[PDB]
Symmetry: D3
Subunit: 158 residues, 6 copies
């Protein structure tokens, strides 16, 4: 009956993210991807756009589901009967802040955080950098799920 | 007679800050906590409210006083006859930026900076993260002085 | 049927280690502590001494067992039908090397590594520093399992 | 035919930047300082002011030129027939972000990035921190080229 | 005419090293790989064997040559009319120590050091870890040049 | 009655160390340089040589004294009625290890550790790297006090 939550803003989800999802799904009975949107800064995609892109990318993971959340991440995790978070590490990760959030989350609700390093091929993509490169005409297609890539072109052509 | 300045925005003061204050007060004859506002941010608490919360938290430290400041930190320090800064290190501290400021402050005014690591129990609280957790209904009472936590719930309600 | 391996030299096991064991045991169905002794540098305790100290400390973890290993860690993990490693992070951890080993281990055998930050109270103990402090007469009793503490005094009084 | 681009916003150029420019100019046949502009963000100095400050402080480097641009850095580099970037490292550099950008730039365009440590004397100045200290009256004259310092004081005193 | 030295013990050369060599050879007119032995370690391969493995791996790089050296690195560099070093960065690199050596080398001889990040695929191999994995029967063939991997299995058998 | 201990093996003392000694002496009433010896590891200089090199280079600091010791650092500190350590930070410092030691020393004896960044000019010298460069004939004269340099050359030329 094990389980973990993979949280993030996922604007959009990248192959770095998907790699983390897959490993979480391989090692825990149940995985929930929590789409948690920053309230002070709306992004490129709407919440249900973000959710759809993740669902499309994770169709081959039977024990994974995708839900949006508001408020504390630890409440999202516990309200679903779990108490484990899985986060990815990549080139550019602010690991010090990850550690700060991990300790805070453990303190306030007893939720553990597990970190896993993303695959080297996907270690340098992030949502913001992929969007920036794409805005300026660069090819980030090898770093994003195919479904995301087309939607991203749409949002930019607009 | 020795002395140091403990600068920050303290919005609000945390037990991590208080740990640093106590260590500075134990090792220097005089400590001045300098409450310095970022001119384009305002924050949650007013300067007066911040000073009041620090004073209540440092009531047992007779050689420490609290004062607002504006302008260059090193001017604040030197104008009070001192030339040392004491800064805390916690989980999430941008240490590279602390080092850059320390080198800059030494270069422009000859002021030294001493860093001290906060206690493990208080190493993951920061003003911003405490406010964010509190905003969403999380309990950060063990990470803040008693006076702060009450005032915090007040600004949120 | 989930499971993870917690590897190390554990010379001796500390409360930092025990914290990691407990979280692994809370989040995976099955946990194995692998005692892997460096072949070029014997330590303070023998392998079976190290094992005994861990077993004594982990008696309240039903789904945890302790075994010694030789050769590749990834072979230890896979020969037991698992493919997940759990490692602790503390103050002083060479995280860059942990990342290097994690990527290598994933490359050569498809084994994932999950990192978890130890509790603040136990974040500054390590085997080597605890031994050094103890050698010079300092009190590290709050940082080690009670069983370990007495054995450590014995090895030093010798 | 070797060459490298030294990119940045240079608002304003510092002695840390100049140190890096000089290393690059000593080790590559040609160097181009790329003053990259976000057309949406103004900054303190106009693109012409930024270029003039750099040119005045690099006059003794005959193989270095200064050009502005926008959009992708790797496009600026490749359209000049080059595929190397030289970036400086200082105290306060977000090196993890530099690594991410270097890996991304290599991936999308085959462009290499070489990092060099700025000299100790110039290792704690940045454009933003110099601007901040000067705003509050601190003396940053030893950290900026002469082409910059009084121009900076002029911008600040003009509110 | 420009040039750089790529120094190391290369015991053995890895594809991470080779990636760095290729980038240096693409950007400088002349590259010299300097094989420098730690005088109290000997290692797995002799200096001659190390040079041979590098030469086989860099056969397509006509402006790169391989040479053993001893003594101060900056002397090796300056004696060959150059004053640049190129070093690779990988996962596990002690970057703080690289920076210290780079500053020292610039101070004592005016020699510059340029760092370049190795490709992601080759970012987690190192000479020591490859040998350790290979010793215990693990397959590191994708992380080493072909010539190296064969010679490696040989020294182990 | 304020005071701090500046500990280390100082084999030999560097200008980086001296910079830290000077900061400590300016900010605490008394400073003790603790030359800590492992009785099993010899090092290059004897304890008397290490102390003499430090004393010759600190003669202008009237509130600083030099004493050797072994065993726990916190015992050395507390037996002098103090409970502060001052440590320098330089390029190449293992800061994570410094933090671990600082937390351990606080835990076992209530002793505080204050870190200070060494001046840029002296930020890349360490005892071991200076010894290594000098061994191979490099010029480290600008990174060591005069009390050290020729003594170092003497040790090396004596094989
Ligand atoms: C949702 C939450 C976890 C997001 O935090 P986060 O882990 O730092 O991740 P974010 O969504 O902000 O985004 C950072 C990401 O890094 C990248 N990233 C994250 N995971 C990645 C991965 N596996 N691979 C590649 N890149 C990744 C980016 O994609 C993205 O950054 P970018 O915008 O620069 O591209 C956090 O804000 C949260 O918990 N919110 C709920 C409120 C709360 O509980 N607050 C108290 C916290 S203690
Ligand atoms: C067994 C092995 C994982 C040990 O590596 P390691 O994770 O770095 O851990 P180690 O046992 O060497 O010891 C480091 C530890 O850090 C500390 N430590 C480790 N985990 C800790 C924790 N959870 N809490 C507190 N401290 C901890 C120490 O206790 C100890 O160091 P110390 O001796 O300085 O006290 C590794 O060497 C290995 O895999 N060996 C098998 C051979 C192999 O597969 N090699 C190829 C690897 S890719
Ligand atoms: C222009 C570019 C090279 C950035 O240059 P940079 O030197 O790395 O950083 P910049 O020059 O833009 O920014 C200013 C620097 O950061 C500083 N800074 C100040 N506040 C900062 C903050 N909150 N965050 C980050 N940097 C800050 C400045 O002080 C300055 O430091 P410096 O004086 O030493 O140079 C990079 O943004 C780029 O390539 N843009 C083109 C678009 C592109 O190609 N994107 C894809 C990248 S993979
Ligand atoms: C003595 C003590 C303070 C260490 O001092 P330190 O300045 O932090 O480091 P040391 O002086 O011993 O060691 C030499 C330094 O590391 C260097 N060094 C060289 N090779 C090194 C290596 N392989 N690893 C680590 N350091 C190395 C030296 O160059 C030197 O740097 P520096 O010149 O800038 O000072 C610490 O070991 C101690 O407190 N010992 C007493 C016993 C004790 O209390 N133990 C409990 C500690 S919690
Ligand atoms: C006041 C001053 C010392 C900054 O203080 P600081 O402690 O280093 O930084 P702050 O006071 O803002 O504190 C950091 C805090 O900001 C908040 N914060 C949130 N997000 C942040 C972010 N992205 N960046 C910075 N701070 C952030 C708090 O979380 C946080 O930590 P803390 O609560 O544990 O202290 C500095 O700005 C200063 O000297 N100002 C005077 C002007 C001057 O002299 N400038 C020249 C300096 S060389
Ligand atoms: C030759 C020299 C450049 C060192 O090279 P380096 O690449 O920085 O370090 P090495 O060549 O040993 O390479 C590091 C390698 O050591 C091995 N290694 C294993 N454990 C190690 C450890 N704890 N520390 C260092 N290296 C280790 C390899 O794993 C490893 O990485 P790599 O295979 O990816 O390159 C340097 O020692 C030198 O300049 N020597 C000449 C003398 C001199 O001039 N000294 C003054 C320098 S300022």
């Amino acid at each position: 009956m094990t389980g973990a939550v993979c949280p993030g803003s996922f604007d959009p989800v990248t192959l770095g993210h998907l790699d983390v999802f897959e490993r979480a799904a391989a090692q825990f009975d149940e995985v929930i991807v929590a789409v948690l949107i920053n309230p002070n800064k709306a992004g490129m995609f709407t919440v249900d756009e973000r959710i759809e892109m993740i669902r499309e990318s994770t169709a081959d993971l039977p024990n994974l589901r995708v839900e949006s959340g508001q408020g504390l991440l630890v409440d999202f995790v516990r309200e679903r009967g779990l108490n484990a978070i899985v986060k990815g590490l990549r080139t550019g990760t602010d690991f010090e802040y990850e550690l700060q959030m991990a300790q805070m989350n453990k303190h306030i609700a007893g939720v553990d955080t597990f970190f896993v390093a993303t695959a080297p091929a996907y270690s340098f993509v992030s949502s913001s950098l992929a969007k920036e490169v794409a805005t300026y005409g660069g090819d980030v297609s090898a770093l994003l799920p195919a479904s995301v890539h087309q939607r991203l072109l749409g949002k930019l052509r607009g």
